Write an enzyme that holds these catalytic residues in place. Structure first.
Site, short mmCIF file in Angstrom:
data_model
loop_
_atom_site.label_atom_id
_atom_site.label_comp_id
_atom_site.label_asym_id
_atom_site.label_seq_id
_atom_site.Cartn_x
_atom_site.Cartn_y
_atom_site.Cartn_z
N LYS A 170 0.85 -1.19 0.00
CA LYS A 170 0.00 0.00 0.00
C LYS A 170 0.89 1.24 0.00
O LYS A 170 1.22 1.77 1.06
CB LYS A 170 -0.94 0.01 1.21
CG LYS A 170 -2.32 0.59 0.94
CD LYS A 170 -2.27 2.06 0.55
CE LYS A 170 -1.75 2.92 1.68
NZ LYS A 170 -1.60 4.35 1.27
N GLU A 245 9.55 1.92 10.97
CA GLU A 245 10.56 2.87 10.51
C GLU A 245 9.96 4.27 10.57
O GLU A 245 9.39 4.76 9.59
CB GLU A 245 11.03 2.54 9.10
CG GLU A 245 11.79 1.23 8.97
CD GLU A 245 13.23 1.33 9.45
OE1 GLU A 245 13.71 2.47 9.64
OE2 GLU A 245 13.87 0.28 9.62
N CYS A 279 13.44 10.82 6.92
CA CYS A 279 13.40 10.41 8.32
C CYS A 279 14.75 10.63 9.01
O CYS A 279 14.80 11.12 10.14
CB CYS A 279 13.00 8.94 8.44
SG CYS A 279 11.28 8.58 7.98
N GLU A 378 10.10 16.65 14.62
CA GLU A 378 10.51 16.52 13.22
C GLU A 378 9.76 17.50 12.33
O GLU A 378 8.53 17.52 12.31
CB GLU A 378 10.28 15.09 12.74
CG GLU A 378 10.88 14.78 11.38
CD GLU A 378 10.70 13.34 10.98
OE1 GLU A 378 9.62 12.77 11.27
OE2 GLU A 378 11.64 12.76 10.38
#
Ligand code: CA
Ligand code: CA
Ligand code: CA
Ligand code: CA
Ligand code: CA
Ligand code: MG
Ligand code: MG
Ligand code: MG
Lengths: 476, 476, 476, 476
Positions: A170, A245, A279, A378
């Site tokens: 997906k 992750e 990331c 972040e």
């Protein structure tokens, strides 16, 4: 607008579509199928058939050759894939070409790994023979984000396929056109129908349906911590293991004895690449007091020359993926400005850049408070936060002072300090006098804390995509 | 009736207790501290300090010697620990002694494994050196059930300690007195204060507080699937990885060419041991049609000779852990009898066995429909379900036909058939012409599906109690 | 005056013993049996029966417990063993104690490695299962020298026992008394009769008979290159593999940015320890020109303050092993002097040191030509040769410029330089800002070129004492 | 008639040549270079340059890509290679083709193993980081025999190249044309000049010069035990390690419960393939008494149906390599016939087979005494020795009763017996209900006793072509 199920392109069950937007001008140019629960059901069914069928009947060496052929297909189709990825994600063509090259590298590496994934024989009682085998989970689920559609695909699916799993994917609704084309390449490579299934659609629809599906045996997730939490909790209903992750706030630690000339370009590229939408982005630079001001000046010099424009212009940065993310970066910068956090330097959006595009110039802020949201959360933009430390202890305290722990960079001449810090730092990867120069395909990647858990990339990834079976024989 | 926090016995924060009941007579003979959230807070605090201090400063070899000394202490305290365990869990003295011996074996094995847990160096670009290190998570949480307090403590805490983690343990409220005594032995062995912490209490109180706590880095769970789901979802809030060692419906597969004389006693003890209160209990026996009726008759004769009495009586079987579990077994047997499932044979509780005790004779039922609840759901009692199969294909279909997948036993003389089936069966462990050689300390243990995920026991367990860090050195 | 064969102390076939000399006064105080071919025959035959009998029937875990108990007996006998070793070899009592402790550590380490020596399961064709087993050679031959009787015994035999072999040992005629005592301790520890056999005698007799014997399956040799060559050629007649642990000319590489304060005592100890009678002794120091003269000056001051005397005096250094070796050292020094090589400094032999003893004061020589015999050949005495280099290239060229390649030391603060040189240096072990650590039991040890081949110490040693059997099962 | 040195084909130093003979008609059809010592000197120097330069500078991943390209080149040229091999060795075209495919499979396998040869990080003292790096030996020597020039070149050079070595090859003077062609394909594949060198010639000239050369770091030998003994002693002068792949007397153990229908063609093919000129050929069959006579007659019929003719005729078997080997086999058959050993059956040489050819029909001898030379010595012909055994003990005693120990076959349906015997047999490889399988590239191959030592093929081979360096970092 069709899914890729059982080796054929099939219409969505509820026959709805999702617009594909080029973030360079913010205009739709294609559509993807709006995947729903019945679409996931058909994908898992196809994956189950392939695993219990031809693909599962294949030997590891045979799986490797398919993967190697696929690697060659990607290499031959680099420019085609780079065009699709750049138009869809917004990244400069130079980076989209690198992603395609990295994609072929993932498939090439794991192609040689398949028949070399060894189990063990264990010493036991007399008259006993104990052996272990690393078997695929069966059907693996893959949630792939929008910032690196090809790279994370090759990372996740490439390892899962090498392990002997059949896959249900997906990909992200903001960018997934490259993944669809790769699926075609896989079919051409000789991958049995059903071994790789792609269901496009929204995360709360197709993505949620995948995570809740009892037909999945293992889930590989890459994305936000909030969504990772949901996926884990959803999959827990079926006791399905999930690799997380997630994001990060990865620090660059620079000491006074560091080669600033060789460090400067890496510090810039680590936060400018993919518009900081990574990331493991180097979003924090921690500088020893002696070289704090000199390094900030150099960083200011570099950032002032940076330019942002359309993906095809192939500049320092492309646009961000969409308006929502653009607003998120704006909010961080706006908050920081209000709190009196000085903007040391910033790039520029080119004058001829489309107004409907979602462009954000790289920004360098200084004297950032450690507890401030800018240095804790972040941003997922080209924003670098600079602050000082007095010694190793404060460097460690600052670096591990956020809930994230993905990657860390160490820049110093002293070798004893290099290895000493690397042990103290909380991160899946520690780079010494660099910051992931190569593709890092061979380097196991993953975080601790709110950066998630588990490891992908490298040979290590194969262990997460297999489950150990122990066979004990009594023979006297 | 106290917790064991920071190397000292500490009263619960709210000063309440939980009754300890001997299931042989159903009477209270002791009390444990009713642990709550503040108690968990102090336990994690102690663990963190210990990990960041003395215990974390210890080398691998130093940790090994500690576990080795502990191993010797346990071995010397076998009789003492067996008396406590048997009185608290209800198991016969012979089994309680074996558990203590297994506990010592866990510590002995992992003592030698501590300084041999190796990372890797990986081939990479020129001018680069890449190394990997397997570091402890930090603070590990441990949920230990009542059926094998010492054994499960040994595999979980023993591996966690060897890996270099500091431990917080929430043992079962129905049986945990043995674990408390083991903690003292650890202190005697030289384990620094805080490295091991024990917080007794209810699962929905102390156990939940552990799973919710953000200061824990990894959780080792062993219990019911329903509880394991909750623990996973609770820990997902802090992105804490959870190992799930859940229940099972493990099948014994017997072919016409099998050694029935050798198989018969193993078939019995595999479901009679600990009153069938074992995750990997052989609760299903699948017999080839040719020897179905003969083997059932031999199983029937064997079951008729089984005697159930007090733990001190040290018979074939003891009482169940409590009234709630006794009633659960009753409901299975009553439903089966109502649906016309014949009970081929059953043992008998001895006359002088206490009426207030929770005694349940081992039961052998035949012609059990595969889709029936008796053959699909875990009973956690001394109940064996028998049914026939025509060929290898149906044997596999029947064996993998439940949601569970933990352990499987194969009984046949045909070598090709042995390995062929072992590859097809869905289980963490496959035993050929045996069933858990004992104690299986070296054998990695874990399930698939609703039996959980992850592996414990053996050397492999150390990988679950560490996290890989990759260090990439650019040196030219 | 007897051999240790089949668990009993048996008299030799010639009955003519060999004197045991104390090098501190050069006077005999004991006798050892002069083993010949018939003594070797009985020892090999005894070991063959042990490997085929009780010892070969023991599980890997059972072998580990024997070794662990043996470790404890050595630890309990440190004073006794050190007394024997010191009196026999001449080394100071402090060094003798360390040898005994290192012996106990070897047994402790390999006690834990025994049941963790894993083979593999290999991916292969459909219908196949391939497993690999690491089986002991059978009967291993061990030639143990005089400089470290206990440590090398523990290194060689401790690994062979853990691997599952039965051992036939021919220790050095100049120092082997300690080994004879350890054999008794092994028996007390529970080692089956015949698993360990000690045959004393001259190398050209008992040693030659051992290297030629067809009953041996593997030879572990430690000694001179000339003898190692002969042993290899002798064992070639029976196609028996030999591990060659020979001497070296290990360099210490010091740069201008190194910590001279931390380096200086290590530079001295690395050549002074055991009177330079060490294969991996730091017999060369390579110094960057900038710190050449200052370091040589401090080295000279250090050397002038060194004291040599009887073993019991427990000074910096003891006597050499015998007159032949003393003369050998004299020949080197005399040769160097006549070639105009300056002696910077030398140690002091105490005046009351017995004249009949074999004493040699440590010597520091400077400006040594790289091509000179002193800088090319192993002295096996407390002689350090100092010279300078201009850059890393010459440092590498000088370091790899001798036929030897055993150990190398790197002293510098530059991290990149540390790793750069480590990869470039031809050696089995490279130490950064230390030398030899730290015991080094866990550290694989061996040479390249004329330093021999193969590895012992550490876990790696078990691979040298086992052979891989691959079992390929066709089951369909 | 030239060598392949430094990437180009150069003339011999003495400009003399060696006749290339087709064993089908015993007629010369080509010439190879008669290599001497100066040719070897240029080959080693070239390899040293490649290792110190371009080839050594290549990353492991880069080496793999060259190997994979070479694998593709071999596959592209199978027909050409098969024709060359068949004409040069004498084997049927069918087997020569299989040899070509095996060669491609070797390169393909090791291409993927290149960047996956990992070192380790070892747990050590506080303030330390220990890592191990597996480095290539440097320049490796390869002696390749005449029976399988391509396959043995593949396993030896393929592994060495993957490990990072530069290779100097001395192929057999009786058959080495195919090896020459492969060298070209390597150059076409992109293999740097000097990385692979081929020097043809007699073993007592080119071969001896290679084995004695101090510029070589490791020797891979495959050939006769006598020559293997010399090579070892020759290289011992330079302390160069030698891997010995020697001959054997590999047994096939057949029990009464065995599937004779599946065993029969394997028993025959294992001894008939390549005219029995295989180190691991099944030259002995041990049959349980109950099926001794039925299986002998069974094997008799099969042997009687065998046909021998020219290689191009592509029958069951071709000619032997030369008159020397033909005479050797004749001597075996004569002695057996003279000692009264009955020949149950034999193959058929076509009456029109070239008289100047070296043809030998396969022979089945029965009631062969275990102590007889025919049952103890390697014939290297299509000769099978049949005898009976009473129980497993005698089967093991007979199987291990020869000085050889390379491969062993076990034919039985009883699973316990399979693994039980597999442990007891002295061999590098044990096959259960098969023999050699297909290719066996992934299966580590090697012998014990007079079969040699060391392991090649499989991933295990990489450890033989590398040497372990340990780096101990003190960083605090
Ligand atoms: Ca898009
Ligand atoms: Ca209780
Ligand atoms: Ca002596
Ligand atoms: Ca001279
Ligand atoms: Ca020829
Ligand atoms: Mg986490
Ligand atoms: Mg599961
Ligand atoms: Mg050399």
């Amino acid at each position: 607008a069709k899914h890729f199920i059982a080796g054929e392109w099939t219409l969505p069950a509820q026959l709805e579509t999702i617009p594909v937007v080029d973030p360079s001008d913010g205009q739709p140019f294609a559509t993807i199928a709006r995947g729903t629960a019945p679409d996931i059901e058909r994908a898992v069914a196809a994956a189950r058939d392939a695993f219990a069928g031809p693909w599962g009947a294949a030997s590891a060496a045979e799986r490797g050759r398919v993967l190697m052929r696929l690697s060659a297909r990607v290499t031959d189709s680099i420019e085609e894939l780079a065009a699709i990825e750049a138009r869809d994600t917004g990244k400069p063509l130079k980076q989209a070409r690198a992603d395609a090259a990295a994609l072929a590298r993932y498939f090439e590496f794991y192609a040689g790994a398949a028949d070399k994934l060894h189990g063990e024989t264990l010493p036991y009682q007399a008259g006993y023979t104990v052996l272990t085998v690393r078997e695929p989970h069966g059907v693996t689920g893959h949630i792939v984000p929008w910032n690196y559609p090809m790279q994370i695909f090759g990372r996740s699916v490439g390892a899962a396929l090498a392990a002997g799993n059949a896959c249900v994917v997906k990909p992200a609704e903001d960018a997934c056109l490259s993944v669809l084309r790769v699926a075609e390449l896989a079919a051409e490579a000789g991958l049995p129908a059903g071994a790789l299934n792609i269901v496009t659609g929204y995360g709360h629809e197709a993505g949620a349906a995948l995570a809740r599906h009892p037909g999945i045996d293992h889930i590989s997730f890459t994305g936000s911590p909030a969504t990772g939490k949901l996926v884990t909790q959803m999959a827990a209903e079926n006791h399905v293991p999930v690799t997380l992750e997630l994001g990060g706030k990865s620090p660059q630690i620079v000491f006074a004895d560091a080669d600033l000339d060789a460090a400067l370009p890496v510090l810039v590229s680590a936060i400018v690449q993919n518009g900081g939408q990574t990331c493991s982005a180097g979003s924090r630079v921690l500088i020893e007091r002696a070289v704090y001001e000199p390094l900030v000046e150099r960083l200011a010099t570099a950032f002032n020359g940076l330019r942002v424009g359309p993906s095809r212009a192939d500049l320092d940065c492309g646009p961000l993926i969409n308006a929502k993310q653009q607003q998120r970066v704006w909010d961080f910068l706006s908050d920081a400005q209000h709190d009196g956090i000085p903007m040391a330097a910033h790039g520029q959006v080119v004058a001829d850049a489309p107004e409907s595009g979602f462009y954000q110039a790289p920004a360098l802020l200084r004297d950032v408070p450690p507890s401030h949201r800018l240095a804790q959360e972040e941003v997922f933009g080209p924003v670098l936060a600079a602050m000082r430390f007095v010694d190793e202890d404060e460097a460690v305290a600052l670096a591990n002072g956020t809930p994230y722990g993905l990657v860390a960079g160490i820049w110093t001449r002293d070798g004893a300090r290099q290895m000493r810090l690397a042990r103290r730092l909380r991160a899946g990867q520690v780079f010494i006098n660099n910051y992931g120069a190569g593709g890092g395909v061979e380097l196991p990647f993953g975080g601790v804390g709110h950066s998630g858990h588990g490891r992908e990339k490298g040979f290590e990834a194969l262990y997460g995509f297999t489950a150990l079976k122990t066979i004990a024989i009594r023979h006297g």
